[PDB]
């Protein structure tokens, strides 16, 4: 243990889930690469260290221990080499920018209107449960071929997978402190299998243009499909983060705009500013805050720390996006800060494959919301609480408007 960081011994998992920003402010100043005992891992907290680890040839992909316990093998986020190349080739077709531009409007905009019509005349709403999450999961769910899985169920699944994936607390001996916390991830996977296995059975014989059907068939010899055990971990990758994060990003962007009322008004009046508003929202509260990791493949020295080969490092991109070496007053949402790079989509060979898709989902959702409710106001009686260390976002977003 590093002597001057003895205070890290007293950092708790609950503290990191409720608000990691004070601890990580200390880490960025004291130890940009630091071993955090309750996480049982080195953690990268600055922009320079996160970007170096994510792009270095001396590191490769790995899943965090609780993430591996949740997803198994071969999750696209945790593999390398030929397997990673295959899984990337598998997911990339529907995510290509030219392809997304062909159909993204006809996918998301009707979905956004459907959810808006349920509440736009009420004068009040809780936008996370009633809008941001449903639009995010319904859009991706239809793309995948899960049209018949209700948005309520998709939302329950990503919540359970979230809690299992981020069940990272370890004890003195490095063993998981809360092994019972993986049970609901196991239950979610069992439910997912019961729903998706019959769909896969069908797609093997009758391919259609759902993404999962293409995952089974694309690039395969005639009459062959990828085995379902080979693609299920990447299905889980989607059913957690791909389902959850566009909703998180929408909602954090909204919370940030409400915190700057003049900027909210600017964006409602000029919706061409919505992409910039979203980019700042992702930097301000990164949806995938500290879920990603890498592992060294050779001895390497990072931020003054000599690491052996085989050392995992958690990439706390949500902290890197508050690096005061790069941003002025990063805890404040500011639509007007200059367009600078950010790490909310990761970096390197394993950077987010769905960036272009995700940005359009969030853009269209906010466009439709502001057109339907231009006089949106935050219910200042009800507070906005953010939760999560691995994945972070607001747990609710109560709003009102004069009808
Ligand atoms: C605002 C929404 C999203 C954010 C902030 C986000 C962020 C991220 C981050 C931080 C990673 C890990 C990058 C790294 O390890 O360096 C990642 C990986 C990934 N994301 Fe996104 N994501 C979002 C939405 C989506 C969506 C909607 C999809 C699919 C339609 C998607 C597909 C993927 C895939 C396939 C990977 C694994 C890439 C690989 O390991 O090769 N993401 N994402
Ligand atoms: C794109 O979805 C995911 C991304 C990550 C990145 O670390 C972890 C779990 C996920 O489900």
Curated annotation (Swiss-Prot):
Designated name of the protein: Aromatic O-demethylase, cytochrome P450 subunit
Molecular function (Gene Ontology), one example: iron ion binding
Binding site for substrate: 237, 241
GO BP terms in the entry: catabolic process
Highest rank taxon of the organism: Bacteria
PROSITE patterns from the UniProt entry: CYTOCHROME_P450 (PS00086)
Assembly: Monomer. Forms a heterodimer with GcoB.
InterPro entries referenced in this protein's UniProt entry, alphabetically: Cyt_P450, Cyt_P450_B, Cyt_P450_CS, Cyt_P450_sf
Known role: Part of a two-component P450 system that efficiently O-demethylates diverse aromatic substrates such as guaiacol and a wide variety of lignin-derived monomers. Is likely involved in lignin degradation, allowing Amycolatopsis sp. ATCC 39116 to catabolize plant biomass. GcoA binds and processes the substrate with electrons supplied by the GcoB subunit.
Organism: Amycolatopsis sp. (strain ATCC 39116 / 75iv2)
Pfam entry (one): p450
EC assignment: 1.14.14.-
UniProt: heme binding residues: 84, 88, 294, 317, 347, 350, 352
Catalytic activity, as annotated: guaiacol + reduced [NADH--hemoprotein reductase] + O2 = oxidized [NADH--hemoprotein reductase] + catechol + formaldehyde + H2O + H(+); 3-methoxycatechol + reduced [NADH--hemoprotein reductase] + O2 = 1,2,3-trihydroxybenzene + oxidized [NADH--hemoprotein reductase] + formaldehyde + H2O + H(+); anisole + reduced [NADH--hemoprotein reductase] + O2 = oxidized [NADH--hemoprotein reductase] + phenol + formaldehyde + H2O + H(+); guaethol + reduced [NADH--hemoprotein reductase] + O2 = oxidized [NADH--hemoprotein reductase] + catechol + acetaldehyde + H2O + H(+)
Keyword Transport in annotation: no
This protein's UniProt keywords: Aromatic hydrocarbons catabolism, Heme, Iron, Metal-binding, Monooxygenase, Oxidoreductase
Pathway assigned to this chain's UniProt record: Aromatic compound metabolism
Cofactor names: heme b
Family affiliation: Belongs to the cytochrome P450 family.
PANTHER family: CYTOCHROME P450 YJIB-RELATED, P450, PUTATIVE (EUROFUNG)-RELATED
